[PDB]
Amino acid sequence: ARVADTISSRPTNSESIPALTAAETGHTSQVVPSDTMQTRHVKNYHSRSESSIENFLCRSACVYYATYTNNSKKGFAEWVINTRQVAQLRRKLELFTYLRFDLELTFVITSAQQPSTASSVDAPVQTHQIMYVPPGGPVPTKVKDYAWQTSTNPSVFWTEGNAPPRMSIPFISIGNAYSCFYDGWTQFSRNGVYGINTLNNMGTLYMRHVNEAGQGPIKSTVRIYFKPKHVKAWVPRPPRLCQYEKQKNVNFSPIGVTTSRTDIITT
Amino acid sequence: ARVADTISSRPTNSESIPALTAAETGHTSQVVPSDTMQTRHVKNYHSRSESSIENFLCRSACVYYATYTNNSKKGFAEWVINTRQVAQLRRKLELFTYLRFDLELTFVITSAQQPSTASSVDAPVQTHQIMYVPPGGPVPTKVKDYAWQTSTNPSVFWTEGNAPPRMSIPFISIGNAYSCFYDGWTQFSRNGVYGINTLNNMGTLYMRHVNEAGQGPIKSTVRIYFKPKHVKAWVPRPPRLCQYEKQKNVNFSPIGVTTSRTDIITT
Amino acid sequence: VEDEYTAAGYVTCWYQTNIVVPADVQSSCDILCFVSACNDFSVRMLKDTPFIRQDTFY
Amino acid sequence: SDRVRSITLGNSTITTQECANVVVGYGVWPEYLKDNEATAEDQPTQPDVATCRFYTLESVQWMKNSAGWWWKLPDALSQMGLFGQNMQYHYLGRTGYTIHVQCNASKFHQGCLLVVCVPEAEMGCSNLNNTPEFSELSGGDSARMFTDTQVGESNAKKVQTAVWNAGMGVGVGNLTIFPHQWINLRTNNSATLVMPYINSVPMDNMFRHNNLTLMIIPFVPLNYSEGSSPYVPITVTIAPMCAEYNGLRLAS
Amino acid sequence: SDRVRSITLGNSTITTQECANVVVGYGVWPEYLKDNEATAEDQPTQPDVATCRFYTLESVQWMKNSAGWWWKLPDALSQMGLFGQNMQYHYLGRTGYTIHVQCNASKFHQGCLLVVCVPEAEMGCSNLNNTPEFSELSGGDSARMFTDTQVGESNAKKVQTAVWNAGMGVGVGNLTIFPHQWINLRTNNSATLVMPYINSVPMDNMFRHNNLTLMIIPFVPLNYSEGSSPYVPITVTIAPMCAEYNGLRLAS
Amino acid sequence: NVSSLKAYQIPVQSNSDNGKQVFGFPLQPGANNVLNRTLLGEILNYYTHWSGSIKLTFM
Amino acid sequence: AQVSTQKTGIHYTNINYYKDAASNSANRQDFTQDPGKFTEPVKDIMVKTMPALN
Amino acid sequence: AQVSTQKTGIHYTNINYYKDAASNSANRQDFTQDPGKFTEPVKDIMVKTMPALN
Ligand SMILES: CCCCCCCCCCCCCCCC(=O)O
Ligand SMILES: CCCCCCCCCCCCCCCC(=O)O
């Protein structure tokens, strides 16, 4: 993807006006710097390969982290899948209005020892289970539940001390693209929920320890990473100026357009 | 496996009656919606690939879990192989009358530390043995037994902290297909056992620790997962309405066909 | 699952004319209803069913 | 001479003697739905002369301390002729648009306007917990206006209408990434934008979803001297293009 | 078996298991206006699925002392869907019709009905000096009924509704010169008539002129024995065919 | 009528008026309790998305 | 080595390593339909436009 | 096996192992540009040397 090269030029005295235009037409001028001054011939070998949509968006970014305790009544974690609780991936995806990609999912699981009271605490290797429930299915209510039978829901098992678990997800949607912005309601009477919460229905993700609480409590933490593959994008958008405040909507507090200086001629 | 597409149509005034039929023949009508109203031409690209018998049944499902303790007289586990102690795989397999598949077997083994009384408890890595005895062979009676010599019975060994063990099983049967339902007895005098227990003879599965009880008791738990491959199916069946009560038979308590509403015109 | 963004509508039934019956015939009749799918029906994204329970092994 | 146009749609005509070029969307002209992209399988309705014509909204006054105005686009035409009657009896629909903003003044006045068209312009609220209710987000062919101040948090359901944030939390100078034109009273008299149908679905309901927003923001304020005309109006004219509908039912 | 039909128009369907033939006008099927007969020179509107469909009027009870009913045809469909909305915004229009009258009873009932369609059925008044006012000549999809008696001259603006004169001063037995069918409860269950556009001009205004009239007259009265069902309804279903309009203006 | 065979029968009489309603239900083939438990509505409860036409036969 | 077609909305390679046919992978790409044995199990064929009983 | 060109400032080999097209690697080498739909979205074309308004 090489860039255009420079063409040599000569002194002119003519009727053609490249520098004069009209910006009132909504049309950006197509002048090169070899029209306003004398240039030399320069062969450019630079490429635009690092600014593609396939290269700008295909990196792993953290979206959530949750904790769950071993020695606890109903100690397990849940998360409703969205991309609006972090500030860095939300600003990158909201440069466009419609997106369409595959996904790559990676989990990072740690553990920590809690202040127990017994002597000679020695625990074996821990095993974790991460379950995905599509919308409409049965959900777990506790740790020893029948809902963890995973007969048709996809799940994964992992033992501590190995490579992190990874899997792929295709373009799961009902429409033809994902929508970052929705200007409308969910009811036909125009009441209630207004915004992007009317389109978010992706499921819930559950996490638990498979072992038993032997002689000491253990507190674990999972971290989730998103990586879009095979990306298409439509209708670009200005970047966000103000800071994000909530998750469901786009409410903000107003702020200035830039920072200030002391004069108009200050360099 | 693309679905059929829509054909355009015109206003009619004729003798042909697609909407009128007779459901008394036991014959489902073959009308498309381009016979009862005016349609446009629509090319459908949808596929029926996710509803095949190879895609509906080829997922891993938990069938049993058992425990066994290290510091115990006769501490080991046994299980007679069947698919009728869980509620989610039993309802999926009983949509058909006859089935024929290969198998894939996966085990998930954990451990836990029991409240010992000694100081400086530190145990090495644990090793487990899982043995399969076909019907008629010798069975173990204790942990230090001669029956664990596994000269011709297939067994597996596994050290804690690795990938889970996995193996394949072919279509082992005496008939031409597995039978989910059997309407008959085992005696010619029509006494005694009635039902599916007359056809179940698959063997027993044994589990033990190979290490010795060093200085502290350890309680382990295995979990078993089934995955049918190369599936054929015959004679479909209505799904089960009531809740399962036992394992050997199909006894139930009666329940209503649906849940109720307050009127026939309630939307 | 129930979702107001992807609703499908309503199915009703009304009397066009009356049920006219002779003498010595019962007036009250009955209607049965059936349901099925056409040849463009398809499904996606296999999950679990909410129509079964368990507490302990059978 | 590029300075003259003439647009003819149905039984209506626009004539202009002082104009810039015509901006066409993202390079795409409006068109009917094809057989490869269709999902609703019954025959659509195309009236095509009774709906595809120029409808004129109300007029607003450009004052000196004026901040801006906006319109939600498949909502101002909800009581206009036979276009607003097909929306009530049908469930689906898709439309392209042609917008013509027009404002004239003499050679002794000055000022500049930005006329953009924003797809999916979701707006925010002044109270940080709620969302704005329907009466503030749009009106029936009547402009909702921005203000140069900041709406306080003591109100519950009101739009945050600070102009430099454009209601959406972004910079107002970066709104030129959308298809737009300028009206400069030194040289220009009108602006014309042609927009195709933009959505993530091939058809949509036109009463629960506004998929376009037309904003008019004065960057350079209106100025004149003593004796010149103080009243300067702005008028907007919208024409639907290649509209079709599906799903007949009761009147809603 | 000639006894079954199926008519499909838009998103609606009629099915019949006991029927006579279909009567087609004067041998002519409805069609659009040609280029040789046109006089209005702007482009017409043809919605063609939103208007050309089956609309069902109200139901009337066939009693024993029952005399007849009538409907004025481009007036009962004046509040029906998108057909009655195009009539309010346009000035001209032309339409053909499809009428389906339907009445069922058992094998133990008897009676006969005549279903005719009369073009330009101008009616008379009971007072010999005046003409009947609008409220008696037609109703909004509600039947106006004849009576077996004679309306007195003491009333001022009322229709003379004696059945044997058919409201027009002619013999009621000679109404079979118009396109018609019979409903005989011994053999028949419905009647279907297809009517083209009949006028002396190629287009006409549909609010000042009714160019068709549908009459249903019981020649043999309804009779049954004790125990049979006493309530017998009659239902009418009309579908416009090949409708087009001209002259957009305000809503009237 | 749910613990009976009367749940499948739709009552039909001879009236003294016109235009009465027989039944009515919303079209939700996997969430509405009318079409929930049928042969079509049990296969749909194993999946999440569905698409296509639906036949309704009356006898 | 088998080269197959890799379901989309491009190819892949597959080699078998074991001696028994029960050790292979799942089929997952056998799309075959015969709905007529359940929906029309009648003796004489029925045309849609004709009546059912004559 | 696909043989591609391995971006420099030499080839490499790529084989697909899974049955679904969502399991492949990223594209990373699809360089295509069309800036004219954003920078010049006008009806009549504008030559650079000519004036904008005549
Ligand atoms: C163990 C398997 C886990 C399966 C996880 C599947 C998660 C689904 C991913 C949904 C992508 C969400 C994209 C953003 C949605 C939107 O912007 O509207
Ligand atoms: C370590 C090797 C273990 C070998 C395990 C072999 C288990 C045999 C599997 C039998 C399949 C049972 C299928 C259901 C039987 C039925 O429904 O009647």
PDB file of N, CA, C and O in Angstrom, chain A residues 30-59:
ATOM      1  N   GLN A  30      -8.109  18.797  -3.367  1.00  0.00           N
ATOM      2  CA  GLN A  30      -7.230  17.707  -3.770  1.00  0.00           C
ATOM      3  C   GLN A  30      -5.883  18.224  -4.260  1.00  0.00           C
ATOM      4  O   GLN A  30      -5.295  17.679  -5.195  1.00  0.00           O
ATOM      5  N   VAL A  31      -5.378  19.274  -3.635  1.00  0.00           N
ATOM      6  CA  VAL A  31      -4.105  19.847  -4.045  1.00  0.00           C
ATOM      7  C   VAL A  31      -2.959  19.091  -3.393  1.00  0.00           C
ATOM      8  O   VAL A  31      -3.038  18.639  -2.246  1.00  0.00           O
ATOM      9  N   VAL A  32      -1.884  18.942  -4.154  1.00  0.00           N
ATOM     10  CA  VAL A  32      -0.633  18.357  -3.689  1.00  0.00           C
ATOM     11  C   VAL A  32       0.326  19.528  -3.515  1.00  0.00           C
ATOM     12  O   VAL A  32       0.073  20.602  -4.078  1.00  0.00           O
ATOM     13  N   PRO A  33       1.413  19.404  -2.744  1.00  0.00           N
ATOM     14  CA  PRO A  33       2.336  20.542  -2.597  1.00  0.00           C
ATOM     15  C   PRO A  33       3.192  20.833  -3.820  1.00  0.00           C
ATOM     16  O   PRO A  33       3.974  21.788  -3.782  1.00  0.00           O
ATOM     17  N   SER A  34       3.085  20.064  -4.900  1.00  0.00           N
ATOM     18  CA  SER A  34       3.778  20.370  -6.141  1.00  0.00           C
ATOM     19  C   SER A  34       2.985  21.307  -7.037  1.00  0.00           C
ATOM     20  O   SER A  34       3.347  21.485  -8.203  1.00  0.00           O
ATOM     21  N   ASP A  35       1.904  21.894  -6.523  1.00  0.00           N
ATOM     22  CA  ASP A  35       1.125  22.887  -7.242  1.00  0.00           C
ATOM     23  C   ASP A  35       1.317  24.297  -6.714  1.00  0.00           C
ATOM     24  O   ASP A  35       1.038  25.253  -7.440  1.00  0.00           O
ATOM     25  N   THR A  36       1.783  24.446  -5.478  1.00  0.00           N
ATOM     26  CA  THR A  36       1.952  25.748  -4.857  1.00  0.00           C
ATOM     27  C   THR A  36       3.402  26.198  -4.774  1.00  0.00           C
ATOM     28  O   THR A  36       3.649  27.365  -4.454  1.00  0.00           O
ATOM     29  N   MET A  37       4.361  25.319  -5.048  1.00  0.00           N
ATOM     30  CA  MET A  37       5.770  25.669  -4.976  1.00  0.00           C
ATOM     31  C   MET A  37       6.549  24.748  -5.903  1.00  0.00           C
ATOM     32  O   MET A  37       6.002  23.810  -6.482  1.00  0.00           O
ATOM     33  N   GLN A  38       7.841  25.031  -6.044  1.00  0.00           N
ATOM     34  CA  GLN A  38       8.726  24.226  -6.876  1.00  0.00           C
ATOM     35  C   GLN A  38       9.235  23.042  -6.069  1.00  0.00           C
ATOM     36  O   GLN A  38       9.820  23.223  -4.998  1.00  0.00           O
ATOM     37  N   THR A  39       9.025  21.839  -6.586  1.00  0.00           N
ATOM     38  CA  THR A  39       9.425  20.618  -5.914  1.00  0.00           C
ATOM     39  C   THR A  39      10.449  19.865  -6.752  1.00  0.00           C
ATOM     40  O   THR A  39      10.714  20.199  -7.907  1.00  0.00           O
ATOM     41  N   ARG A  40      11.031  18.844  -6.137  1.00  0.00           N
ATOM     42  CA  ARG A  40      11.890  17.882  -6.804  1.00  0.00           C
ATOM     43  C   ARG A  40      11.187  16.533  -6.851  1.00  0.00           C
ATOM     44  O   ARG A  40      10.194  16.299  -6.162  1.00  0.00           O
ATOM     45  N   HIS A  41      11.713  15.638  -7.678  1.00  0.00           N
ATOM     46  CA  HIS A  41      11.166  14.293  -7.777  1.00  0.00           C
ATOM     47  C   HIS A  41      11.673  13.453  -6.611  1.00  0.00           C
ATOM     48  O   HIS A  41      12.885  13.316  -6.420  1.00  0.00           O
ATOM     49  N   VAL A  42      10.750  12.905  -5.829  1.00  0.00           N
ATOM     50  CA  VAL A  42      11.063  12.084  -4.666  1.00  0.00           C
ATOM     51  C   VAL A  42      10.250  10.805  -4.767  1.00  0.00           C
ATOM     52  O   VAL A  42       9.025  10.864  -4.876  1.00  0.00           O
ATOM     53  N   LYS A  43      10.923   9.658  -4.737  1.00  0.00           N
ATOM     54  CA  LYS A  43      10.253   8.364  -4.729  1.00  0.00           C
ATOM     55  C   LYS A  43       9.966   7.953  -3.290  1.00  0.00           C
ATOM     56  O   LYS A  43      10.897   7.726  -2.512  1.00  0.00           O
ATOM     57  N   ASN A  44       8.686   7.853  -2.941  1.00  0.00           N
ATOM     58  CA  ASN A  44       8.279   7.446  -1.602  1.00  0.00           C
ATOM     59  C   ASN A  44       8.100   5.940  -1.540  1.00  0.00           C
ATOM     60  O   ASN A  44       7.469   5.344  -2.417  1.00  0.00           O
ATOM     61  N   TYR A  45       8.653   5.331  -0.494  1.00  0.00           N
ATOM     62  CA  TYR A  45       8.519   3.905  -0.244  1.00  0.00           C
ATOM     63  C   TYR A  45       7.692   3.616   0.998  1.00  0.00           C
ATOM     64  O   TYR A  45       7.660   2.471   1.455  1.00  0.00           O
ATOM     65  N   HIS A  46       7.034   4.625   1.557  1.00  0.00           N
ATOM     66  CA  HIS A  46       6.241   4.432   2.758  1.00  0.00           C
ATOM     67  C   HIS A  46       4.950   3.700   2.428  1.00  0.00           C
ATOM     68  O   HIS A  46       4.422   3.802   1.321  1.00  0.00           O
ATOM     69  N   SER A  47       4.436   2.963   3.406  1.00  0.00           N
ATOM     70  CA  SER A  47       3.231   2.170   3.233  1.00  0.00           C
ATOM     71  C   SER A  47       2.237   2.494   4.334  1.00  0.00           C
ATOM     72  O   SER A  47       2.611   2.902   5.433  1.00  0.00           O
ATOM     73  N   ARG A  48       0.959   2.306   4.019  1.00  0.00           N
ATOM     74  CA  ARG A  48      -0.138   2.548   4.951  1.00  0.00           C
ATOM     75  C   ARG A  48      -0.658   1.254   5.555  1.00  0.00           C
ATOM     76  O   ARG A  48      -1.855   1.102   5.784  1.00  0.00           O
ATOM     77  N   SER A  49       0.233   0.302   5.821  1.00  0.00           N
ATOM     78  CA  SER A  49      -0.190  -1.027   6.237  1.00  0.00           C
ATOM     79  C   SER A  49      -0.597  -1.089   7.702  1.00  0.00           C
ATOM     80  O   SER A  49      -1.385  -1.959   8.076  1.00  0.00           O
ATOM     81  N   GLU A  50      -0.083  -0.199   8.538  1.00  0.00           N
ATOM     82  CA  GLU A  50      -0.330  -0.277   9.971  1.00  0.00           C
ATOM     83  C   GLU A  50      -1.584   0.466  10.405  1.00  0.00           C
ATOM     84  O   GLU A  50      -1.943   0.412  11.583  1.00  0.00           O
ATOM     85  N   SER A  51      -2.265   1.150   9.493  1.00  0.00           N
ATOM     86  CA  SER A  51      -3.451   1.914   9.839  1.00  0.00           C
ATOM     87  C   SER A  51      -4.727   1.280   9.315  1.00  0.00           C
ATOM     88  O   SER A  51      -5.777   1.923   9.342  1.00  0.00           O
ATOM     89  N   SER A  52      -4.669   0.036   8.854  1.00  0.00           N
ATOM     90  CA  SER A  52      -5.854  -0.635   8.356  1.00  0.00           C
ATOM     91  C   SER A  52      -6.791  -0.982   9.503  1.00  0.00           C
ATOM     92  O   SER A  52      -6.400  -1.009  10.668  1.00  0.00           O
ATOM     93  N   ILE A  53      -8.050  -1.253   9.155  1.00  0.00           N
ATOM     94  CA  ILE A  53      -9.028  -1.638  10.167  1.00  0.00           C
ATOM     95  C   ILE A  53      -8.700  -3.022  10.719  1.00  0.00           C
ATOM     96  O   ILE A  53      -8.954  -3.311  11.893  1.00  0.00           O
ATOM     97  N   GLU A  54      -8.076  -3.873   9.908  1.00  0.00           N
ATOM     98  CA  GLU A  54      -7.611  -5.170  10.380  1.00  0.00           C
ATOM     99  C   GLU A  54      -6.420  -5.066  11.324  1.00  0.00           C
ATOM    100  O   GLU A  54      -6.189  -5.988  12.106  1.00  0.00           O
ATOM    101  N   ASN A  55      -5.655  -3.978  11.266  1.00  0.00           N
ATOM    102  CA  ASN A  55      -4.498  -3.816  12.135  1.00  0.00           C
ATOM    103  C   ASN A  55      -4.781  -2.917  13.326  1.00  0.00           C
ATOM    104  O   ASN A  55      -4.102  -3.027  14.351  1.00  0.00           O
ATOM    105  N   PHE A  56      -5.764  -2.028  13.210  1.00  0.00           N
ATOM    106  CA  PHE A  56      -6.091  -1.107  14.290  1.00  0.00           C
ATOM    107  C   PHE A  56      -6.889  -1.782  15.397  1.00  0.00           C
ATOM    108  O   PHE A  56      -6.730  -1.432  16.569  1.00  0.00           O
ATOM    109  N   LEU A  57      -7.726  -2.764  15.057  1.00  0.00           N
ATOM    110  CA  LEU A  57      -8.666  -3.335  16.010  1.00  0.00           C
ATOM    111  C   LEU A  57      -8.307  -4.730  16.498  1.00  0.00           C
ATOM    112  O   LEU A  57      -8.873  -5.171  17.500  1.00  0.00           O
ATOM    113  N   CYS A  58      -7.386  -5.428  15.838  1.00  0.00           N
ATOM    114  CA  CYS A  58      -7.096  -6.826  16.161  1.00  0.00           C
ATOM    115  C   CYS A  58      -5.983  -6.919  17.205  1.00  0.00           C
ATOM    116  O   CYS A  58      -4.880  -7.400  16.951  1.00  0.00           O
ATOM    117  N   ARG A  59      -6.302  -6.448  18.409  1.00  0.00           N
ATOM    118  CA  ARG A  59      -5.434  -6.596  19.568  1.00  0.00           C
ATOM    119  C   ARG A  59      -6.291  -6.943  20.776  1.00  0.00           C
ATOM    120  O   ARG A  59      -7.478  -6.616  20.829  1.00  0.00           O
TER     121      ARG A  59
END
